[PDB]
Amino acid sequence: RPTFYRQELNKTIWEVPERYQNLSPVGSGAYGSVCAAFDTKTGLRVAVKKLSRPFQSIIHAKRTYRELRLLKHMKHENVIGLLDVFTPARSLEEFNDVYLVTHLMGADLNNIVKCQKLTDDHVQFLIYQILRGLKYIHSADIIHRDLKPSNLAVNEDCELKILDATRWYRAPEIMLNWMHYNQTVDIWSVGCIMAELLTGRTLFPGTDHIDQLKLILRLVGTPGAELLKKISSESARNYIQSLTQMPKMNFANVFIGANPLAVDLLEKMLVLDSDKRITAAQALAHAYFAQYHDPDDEPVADPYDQSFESRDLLIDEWKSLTYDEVISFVPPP
Residues that bind ligand 8OT (CB under 6 A): 26-27, 34, 47, 49, 71, 100, 102, 104-105, 151, 153, 163-164, 172-173, 176, 178, 213, 223, 230-233, 236, 240, 272-275
Give the chain's count of helices (H) and strands (E). 12, 10
Q: Least separation, in Å, of the C-beta of 179 and ligand 8OT?
A: 7
Nearest to 220 by CA among 198, 190, 251: 251
The reply, when asked if residue 32 is annotated as ligand binding, is yes
326 is in an annotated binding site: no
Which residue's CB is nearer to ligand 8OT, number 173 or number 196?
A: 173
Q: Give least dist CB 151 to ligand 8OT, A.
A: 5
Q: Which is nearer to ligand 8OT, 77 or 120 (CB)?
A: 77
Task: State the alpha helices, DSSP H only, in 42-97.
Answer: 58-73
Query: 174: exposed, middle or buried (C-beta count within 10 Å: 0-12, 13-18, 19+)?
Result: middle
CA distance 209 to 37: 39
Minimal distance in Å, beta carbon 193 to ligand 8OT? 14
SS3 85: strand
- DSSP, collapsed to helix, strand or coil, labels residue 332 as coil
Tally the residues of the chain.
333
The active-site residue, picked from 84, 121, 141, 164, is: 164
The answer to whether 164 is a known catalytic residue is yes
191 is in an annotated binding site: no
Q: Which is nearer to ligand 8OT, 27 or 200 (CB)?
A: 27
Q: Which residues contact 115 (CB under 8 A, 6 or more apart)?
A: 200, 201
- CA–CA gap between residue 217 and residue 145 (Å, rounded): 20
Q: Which is nearer to ligand 8OT, 138 or 148 (CB)?
A: 148
**Residue 31 marked in a binding site:** yes
CB of 311 to ligand 8OT, least distance (A): 24
End-to-end CA distance of the chain: 20
- DSSP-derived letter for residue 151 is G
34 is in an annotated binding site: yes
Q: Which residues are annotated as a binding site for ATP?
A: 26-34, 49
Q: Which residues are annotated as a binding site?
A: 26-34, 49
Catalytic residues: 164
